[model samples]
Target: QEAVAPEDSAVVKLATDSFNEYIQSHDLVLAEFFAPWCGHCKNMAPEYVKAAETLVEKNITLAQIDCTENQDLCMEHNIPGFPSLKIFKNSDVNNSIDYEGPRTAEAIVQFMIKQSQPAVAVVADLPAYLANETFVTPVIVQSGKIDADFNATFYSMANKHFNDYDFVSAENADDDFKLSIYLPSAMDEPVVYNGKKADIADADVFEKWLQVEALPYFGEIDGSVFAQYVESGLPLGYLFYNDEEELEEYKPLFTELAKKNRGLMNFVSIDARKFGRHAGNLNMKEQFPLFAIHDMTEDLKYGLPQLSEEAFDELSDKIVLESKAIESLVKDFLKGDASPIVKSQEIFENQDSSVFQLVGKNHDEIVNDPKKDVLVLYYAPWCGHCKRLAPTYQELADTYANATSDVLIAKLDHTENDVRGVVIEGYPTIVLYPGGKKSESVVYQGSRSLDSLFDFIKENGHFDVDGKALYEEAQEKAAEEADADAELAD
Candidate 1:
């Protein structure tokens, strides 16, 4: 009954008379089922027109139908609301896919661009796409379709990173490769995706794989792109060198090794003269041309334990910091055989105390004692809450000093310790590790009062000793002593 279209708009005006004919004629058409009296439908007209004008260049047409006049066509498509967008492919006329994307012009344009092409482009000649010298962008090709779920995930990931990477679905050749990435002209062999079908089906996992695979074989490690590599959720290998000459000397060897281990790790060259302080952070010696890998996922660092001439030979027959030696280190690391450099404060020399002191060095050993129920207060030195709770915590610890059970009340400076898997949600976090169930750490969510802390330990601790009862007994004794002292003075 009403046409919401402007005279010069590119949106295809469709009615019941030519609706099926128009959709069948176009390869890809975005059909908007709308009612003329709807305010939201009227508001979307300009943005939809802008999207239609932009998408025409991509050969994807934006079409609209007024449900008031074309009730039969709208009802057949199950149009429930004022405006519903559906994607009509010429190949599948009956199964028009729902358009759940944003309604803005650019968002609609991008979504249509994603819908225009097959989720993964079907390539007849994979070799031709791989060998294009001028088109140097990396190409990720899947051999054969797995399932509907995997296809949907791949489509979403491809759509999200459409501008950055190229995705292709090709026929499985005689080779048994399921998925592989053909890098730019500089690289030769394709990096195969050696992950499980379930992982590939996950959107985040697949996207992470794509991002790691898309990184340069060997790149400069600096402040600009450091966080990107770290956030890729992969360990990074840094080849520290003093100058350009040292980089050039080791570039070929590092590049070759990096190619061999693409997704496992990222090998980068860092000018140590400018970023020498970082080498210290990795616990590398002051020597130039050092190598280290930081497993950011686990917050662990690995490097050569010794940089001596003999230690270099101990690693391999190669000279100090040579190609063979570095390669051996990398191989050892990949095999999960390298020892992580742990940061810990020096253990206390004076052990005799009312409250047990916990340092990073003896953290696991003390907390994981099978016979002792441990209550650890993970605190920061500069925190006001921690400072406020210090005296009360000390009092609690002293009360447990001669407890009936093997209960060790201790505290650790979280700032100085690097305890793995222990997530400190905030400062002054108190966790109780029951004697037998050391792995299951229970946090104290109650108020930070002495009585509440005692109740927490008593309730959560394996041994059923009333710590609050002990505190009350000590208070009674102190009050009696004060009365005796006052009576003697009188």
Candidate 2:
């Protein structure tokens, strides 16, 4: 039988000569530049190939160049990172996008489609629209003259101004069909309604609406209610409820919701009177707007300053990364029955003394008085690896003590005065001292499983006399237990 070639696993290998020829020959080309060894690049390989295949069917020229083997090509383009895709039109770069997350085929397709859309131009200034709230008109309605036609004109003007970057205008209506609408947009466009009416002359009517209706809504819209406004494109003016009684009752509920879902909402108090009194303190606010994340275990504050669109984007990315890392750590801890190890000192005092001992001149001693070969573990309370290895260390000490009379095992808290003489740079250091001499010392750094540590001791001649005998006895006892279990099952 003939061998079949692997499908969808092949990657394009481009050299400097090939890259130059391909770029010059193709129009409307999309090229992905990547390295082979990067984890992100490796994950993105299948997705990149799938996207290229789709583009090829659509009559779009798609290509990929490996940055690793072709250093000259990458240097010429000033490529700083892997998984960079550049879109070209007529042999010139039109757009450049970098992939930071996992490279799945669906994600790549979505990104390419999104980048193809027309960009929205940010208009810095629209005529009559003031970014600062220094100049704004108030609305007032006298008698029963305010109706739907008047309300529509006020709302349409405000909408036009809002779209054109003029000041923001809000509306307030009573249950009896009497209406008052403030016109911030009227500064730019003439207030018009039903093909033949202008109401710019009613400045006093506008001022009355601002004081009676619009000012109250400012307190009603909090962080939570703002989130709803962002989600639903309903105007801030339409948010006014029926009566003053209803508005007062809903105010606390809106404030509580804003506190709970702050990331989605941003609230600003626009009271010009209060703004004057707090102007000095407001200048000292944080550079970035603030938000927060809270759960049962942890709570974190974000955005200490006033909010901006760019700050929200950066904050969302950070929160997602932190949440994933926390989940991974928790999963690793719950994988097995790996409980923290209790220290030997606690076990020694409660259990038998034959298995372990304190070696020194007095209760507070440093050196072994009998000059016996000793294995000393120098440790700290807060070291994580030390706590994990404590159980294995205690078990080994007991096994050695039962097997040999000459060998002695002890532990020293590095923070204590008696153990301070030993110069140590790392935690949970194991040292074997023979004849109480510094020349005869062996140090082991980092964590190791019990089987490996025991093997090391056996290889170093610590159990040279009867090591094989003790190991055989342990194996024989384990086998006998297995046989006893089998007999009971039968």
Which candidate wins on TM-score? Answer: 1
Worst 10 residues of 2 by lDDT: 291-300
For candidate 1, write residues 1-490 as lDDT tens digits: 2447766888767888878777765566788888877887788788888887776766677778888888888766766577888777543468667777787897777776664565477767777756553464677777754566666666556655556667777765554537777777364667766757775677567777777877777878667567668768678888887767777888888888877776688888888778877776775655667788888777777886546655553564332476777888888988989888666789988686666778888987888776677888887799888888878878888888755647888888876576774756588888887745556468778788988978878787677778889888888887877555555654
Off by over 4 Å in 1: 1-159, 162-208, 222-224, 227-233, 273-277, 280-287, 308-320, 351-353, 379-388, 402-406, 414-416, 420-429, 436-447, 483-490
Clashes of each: 0, 15
Question: lDDT of all predictions, in order shown?
Answer: 0.74, 0.44
Q: Which runs in model 2 stand beyond 4 Å of their true positions?
A: 1-371, 417-421, 436-438, 445-447, 461-469, 475-490
Cα lDDT of model 2 by residue, 10-53, tens digit:
33444677676766554345666777667666665666666656
Q: lDDT of candidate 2?
A: 0.44
Q: Pick the candidate with the highest lDDT.
A: 1
